[PDB]
Amino acid sequence: ELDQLRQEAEQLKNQIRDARKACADATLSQITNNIDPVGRIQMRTRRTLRGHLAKIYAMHWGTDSRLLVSASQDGKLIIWDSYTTNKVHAIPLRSSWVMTCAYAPSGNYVACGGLDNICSIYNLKTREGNVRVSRELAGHTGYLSCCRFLDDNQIVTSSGALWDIETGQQTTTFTGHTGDVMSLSLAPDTRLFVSGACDASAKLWDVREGMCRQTFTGHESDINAICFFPNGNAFATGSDDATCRLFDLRADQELMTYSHDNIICGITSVSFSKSGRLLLAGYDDFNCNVWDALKADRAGVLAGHDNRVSCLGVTDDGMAVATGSWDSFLKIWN
Amino acid sequence: EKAQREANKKIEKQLQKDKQVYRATHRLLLLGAGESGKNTIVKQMRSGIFETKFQVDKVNFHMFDVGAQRDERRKWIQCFNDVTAIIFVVASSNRLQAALKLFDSIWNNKWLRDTSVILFLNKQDLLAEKIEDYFPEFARYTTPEDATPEPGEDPRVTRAKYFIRDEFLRISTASGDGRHYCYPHFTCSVDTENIRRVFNDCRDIIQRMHLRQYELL
């Protein structure tokens, strides 16, 4: 009965811990000690977007690194042109409690979702010229926190799942998490994806088979942000314990911890640069920190925002970094 | 470039005209300890989020319910930091301890320290129950002189209801510090004064915010 279930579960956990310890002799920091430091980086507010009305939760950069999507609590999904600071689209939302938004790689579809437990897919470009509602996925029971497009017909959503746009049905469910899943990221090859829940465990799921390949622990509080490395064999997690962590799928363990004594605020948004050298974490002290992925050093401070930073995104070509916060402002940094 | 500018100005004027009405709507977060009579209140006033629209004295009010959400309320509650008030309902008739703990959690939240809480004691069934073992401090409790019991009410019921009110206020006044205030009320499920009480509390909250804007409070 349950007692020996727990006993062999604990034995399996001990075996996993021993295997992880055996595979680790030297840390990434020791190896990267001998490389040149990144240095102090200065970023200036190139554009500011002030069209929003309430606090802004999520954003997604475009494929062309020029158009972006932003979501705020006023119930408006705003498509922005980052170059000339001219508004491209403004789509009213059925539910004002939108927490996440995604931009399709082809640029023809946009996802939104939130506390309504329903994900809405809109077609940006249509024959008649006005954005309509194209899909309405209402199979989830928990609040939607993150969504990402695999293709024009395949989407992955995070709730606290895989969906086909054509049929609008849940073809794959990713179960195993104990807490509410807050963040989700897509690998460059669109074959695996990591999901972080309201616990120390972050789980990697294969898109096709739909099972949990790997589970990573180490955090001390709820995990809020996750982002794949540009290489695709690693990812970074930002939690509420004022620490950021880097994990890799091949070794299945932690690389280093990015933290400071002066920081006691959780991390809400992480996004790697084009080369992966910068981590670009968003904190609750109204400012973002640029973390060196190899030396665990804060490259720069982005204190332009006045309220809590919720979303941070990096362009596909690594041209500019956009940041939205709990104030109705989106700021672009270089 | 101009072809983009007419669209940009159209979207700008649309956002301005929507902001003209967005600031005229007050958002309220309805919270309760499950079956604490909150649903009866919603039915009296009238799947993830259930929303109710009601206009009082030509002023719109938009209330949000918990809906079909899990018991893990740590995360999504942060989405209601900008609401006008949090109407928190307590079954005053040990669910009382759980309600007190939930009120303590809501009051002391870093993100919810700037929003006010309207405390409702919906279950006024103390007369039926005429409690002392659950709260040892109630045995030595004395009715404060500030109490204003209505005629025709048993003194023990008044003592118990103000004991619960003071038990809530001691947490409320422990770290209020003036940025947010709590407004307890001895209401009932079938009472028609809930709407008026919410109206008055919202007016008081907005007046206090205006005073704080001018540093008069």
């Epitope: 001390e220 004022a242 006691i264 | 018991d71």
Partner: nanobody, 126 residues
Framework: QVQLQESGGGLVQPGGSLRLSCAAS????????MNWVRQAPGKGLEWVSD????????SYTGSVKGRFTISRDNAKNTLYLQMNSLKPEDTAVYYC?????????????????????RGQGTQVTV
């Protein structure tokens, strides 16, 4: 990873005394407020007591006020709970819980079901 282990308990006569221990692993003891919560058979989880990070703020539920006491030791990363003058009403499974967020003077979802930061818990009967 985060893990909480409860030790002690057992079968004691009514009106006796027993001491329960909670051991924490995977996080700093001093950075989180800690809780004891009981769940009676056939009933839901009921909060018992809370202790702050430094132990300055300590409170108990009214049901066991004046009988049960709680203390914490950060150096040993352990929490102690002493029970005196036991009652048949206090027959329940006990769980040592950690507040989800550090450096926060409050915490949510302590008594919520399927809580991640909760220990295995021990049955105490009289």
């Amino acid at each position: 990873q985060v893990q909480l282990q409860e030790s002690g308990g057992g079968l004691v006569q009514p009106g006796g005394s027993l001491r329960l221990s909670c051991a924490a692993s995977g996080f700093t003891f001093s950075n989180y407020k800690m809780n004891w919560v009981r769940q009676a058979p056939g009933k839901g989880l009921e909060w018992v007591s809370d202790i702050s990070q430094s132990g300055a703020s300590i409170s108990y539920t009214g049901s066991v006020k004046g009988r049960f006491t709680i203390s914490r030791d950060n150096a040993k990363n352990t929490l102690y709970l002493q029970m005196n003058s036991l009652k048949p009403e206090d027959t329940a499974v006990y769980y040592c819980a950690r507040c989800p967020a550090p450096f926060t003077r409050d915490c949510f979802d302590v008594t919520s079901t399927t809580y991640a930061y909760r220990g295995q818990g021990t049955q105490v009967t009289v």
